[PDB]
Amino acid sequence: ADCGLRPLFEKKSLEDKTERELLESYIIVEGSDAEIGMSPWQVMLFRKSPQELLCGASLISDRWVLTAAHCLLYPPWDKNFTENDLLVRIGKHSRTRYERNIEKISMLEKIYIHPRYNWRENLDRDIALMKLKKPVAFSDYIHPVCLPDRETAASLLQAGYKGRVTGWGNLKETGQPSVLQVVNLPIVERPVCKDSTRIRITDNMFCAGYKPDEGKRGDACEGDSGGPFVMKSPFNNRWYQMGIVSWGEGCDRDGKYGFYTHVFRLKKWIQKVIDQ
């Protein structure tokens, strides 16, 4: 399809200010404000009752939104949302304003949580789909991201290769942003990921972030959960979602890394649900 080609960038052959950083590597705390239309697949999961941000998410077609399972279901914290508890807001930039004539607000038809999502232990298979009640109209600000094929995943999911994380979550581990935030972060070697934590890491996870000695900073944080870790393919110039913001111990701590759901590894399940 037309996935992963942004109306305000690839479609008009304009580059955003940091995408070159990603390309140069293919050999939110400490982020920046997103540019307008920089992440047109970004979705905000929005609670109705206390009207508040619940999580990030992504648009993968006109009717399907991808997020982290723990955004919807986490029994240890008495979290178990139903379809009616929330809305998805699409095309947003500002965190708090209603963006008249730009954002579109959709209701959920059905939530699907991965049947082997491990909320009991380590958040293994931290992935969920939301089918919308009505298709959303694409615009300059609303456009789906691609899901990776095996070859794009193998070629790009390499240590040192950078992807990009976006969200409206905390700027610090212990303020909130006026607009959507963005940070580019390098994928980390699996042994370094494993050695940074006591949590049992699985093949359905990867980690990203700079090492203490590399100097540069940045991480996702509370409120960024469920949002996309994306990479711009140097083969076809399309953006692909490789990860979902899952977990981390604090935010932007030296020696710690952000963990992300490995989208490709779970793609058979995604397709199973969408095929219905």
Binding site: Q51, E52, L87, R95, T96, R97, Y98, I105, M107
Partner: peptide, 10 residues
């Protein structure tokens, strides 16, 4: 501190 969204969105 979220702006009220249109009531039509339930």
């Amino acid at each position: 501190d979220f702006e009220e969204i249109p009531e039509e969105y339930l």
